[PDB]
Amino acid sequence: SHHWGYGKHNGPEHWHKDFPIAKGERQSPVDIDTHTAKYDPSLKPLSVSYDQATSLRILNNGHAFNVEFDDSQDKAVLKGGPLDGTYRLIQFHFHWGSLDGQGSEHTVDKKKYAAELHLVHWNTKYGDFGKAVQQPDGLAVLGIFLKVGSAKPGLQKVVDVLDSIKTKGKSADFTNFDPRGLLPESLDYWTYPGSLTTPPLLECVTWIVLKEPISVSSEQVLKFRKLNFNGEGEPEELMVDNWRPAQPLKNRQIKASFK
Ligand SMILES: [Hg+2]
Ligand SMILES: [Zn+2]
């Protein structure tokens, strides 16, 4: 990691040299063993309130693409469930595979989905994202699995802008995108305490992983796979397999919101 990435020489097995927390006590993702996960009656109802979300821009950062939100006001927020207080949406992104049989970060009884959507939120008690990532309860990431089947209509606007952000460092205006169109019907979830799944791997995250996947079409995920990890005018390296494998569960319990 000389810069970190997803290749043989810079990928997840190397991250620990620059980021020793990679071998920490609460790393993500994990495998979700559905039989061992326990219903938790202490969880409150989950509230995903995205009606006033204001997207701004879409960016290829060289590892994935981020759809960024204006988080300067109390707008798109996550609350309830395992969370204490209010968490504000700052960005979402995906992780995906070279083939439909892999791509997710979390696994469910060892099953890998084709991709995984991460809606990233910071705890408003800490003022900003940067202060939030110095806290054990600074972030909440809502994770949603993607399987290949029917198209997700609400994803198409993302897909259709990807040609403008092919390479690392490119961005495009991306206003008026409604992340409600990326959610499944059910909010049933699993939750556990973990980390960022990319460097700096900080152990700040309450993970909330929905049980119900969304379906996206083969054509939609094929367009993800046309993105590039490299920058413009550099040798093409397709942006595929940008997922970290499951990490040791260590001294954690995964709780279920459902019976
Ligand atoms: Hg960060
Ligand atoms: Zn992620």
Side-chain angles (χ1 to χ4, degrees), residues 18-180:
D18 284 309
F19 305 94
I21 203 173
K23 291 176 181 286
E25 298 308 306
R26 60 163 274 193
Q27 289 290 294
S28 294
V30 299
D31 181 57
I32 300 167
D33 172 339
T34 68
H35 292 110
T36 301
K38 193 183 180 185
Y39 172 62
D40 185 352
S42 70
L43 292 168
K44 306 268 307 217
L46 191 72
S47 173
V48 184
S49 304
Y50 291 168
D51 36 332
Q52 293 307 148
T54 305
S55 62
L56 291 172
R57 190 177 80 131
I58 189 173
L59 170 70
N60 179 334
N61 61 21
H63 28 94
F65 61 85
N66 293 348
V67 173
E68 301 162 351
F69 290 77
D70 170 5
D71 66 347
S72 72
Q73 222 124 232
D74 177 11
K75 289 179 173 189
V77 302
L78 187 67
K79 82 184 110 50
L83 304 174
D84 294 345
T86 294
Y87 289 68
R88 197 174 294 174
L89 180 67
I90 182 168
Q91 55 108 319
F92 69 77
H93 62 273
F94 304 79
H95 305 261
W96 61 91
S98 56
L99 309 158
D100 300 345
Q102 63 196 51
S104 65
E105 299 209 300
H106 295 89
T107 55
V108 179
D109 294 332
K110 299 297 180 77
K111 187 229 162 86
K112 295 171 166 86
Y113 288 87
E116 187 174 329
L117 165 61
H118 289 162
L119 293 130
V120 182
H121 313 74
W122 55 273
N123 189 332
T124 66
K125 78 192 262 184
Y126 306 122
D128 77 3
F129 179 90
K131 178 60 60 170
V133 302
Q134 299 173 28
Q135 319 302 328
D137 61 351
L139 299 179
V141 184
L142 181 61
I144 303 179
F145 296 121
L146 280 61
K147 64 181 275 185
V148 174
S150 298
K152 192 65 163 173
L155 182 61
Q156 193 62 30
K157 279 204 317 212
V158 173
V159 167
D160 282 337
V161 78
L162 298 183
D163 342 20
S164 76
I165 56 153
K166 185 180 175 183
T167 52
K168 178 174 189 214
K170 284 198 157 297
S171 68
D173 297 321
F174 204 66
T175 55
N176 302 291
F177 180 78
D178 189 343
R180 294 178 295 177

Side-chain angles (χ1 to χ4, degrees), residues 129-130 133 139 196 198-202:
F129 179 90
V133 302
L139 299 179
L196 303 178
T198 68
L201 301 169
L202 296 170

Side-chain angles (χ1 to χ4, degrees), residues 193-258:
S195 74
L196 303 178
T197 71
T198 68
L201 301 169
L202 296 170
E203 292 180 336
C204 316
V205 183
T206 301
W207 279 95
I208 300 169
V209 178
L210 297 189
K211 174 167 171 183
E212 185 177 356
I214 62 166
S215 295
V216 303
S217 67
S218 64
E219 297 78 355
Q220 291 178 317
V221 66
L222 263 294
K223 282 165 188 189
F224 286 17
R225 303 180 184 130
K226 294 185 57 198
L227 288 166
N228 287 183
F229 289 124
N230 59 274
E232 183 180 12
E234 299 179 349
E236 196 167 37
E237 191 64 68
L238 296 179
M239 186 179 279
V240 295
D241 294 317
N242 58 351
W243 54 275
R244 191 189 193 190
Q247 302 301 305
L249 187 64
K250 304 292 165 164
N251 184 44
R252 295 179 290 179
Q253 291 184 322
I254 299 182
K255 294 305 191 174
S257 74
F258 56 92

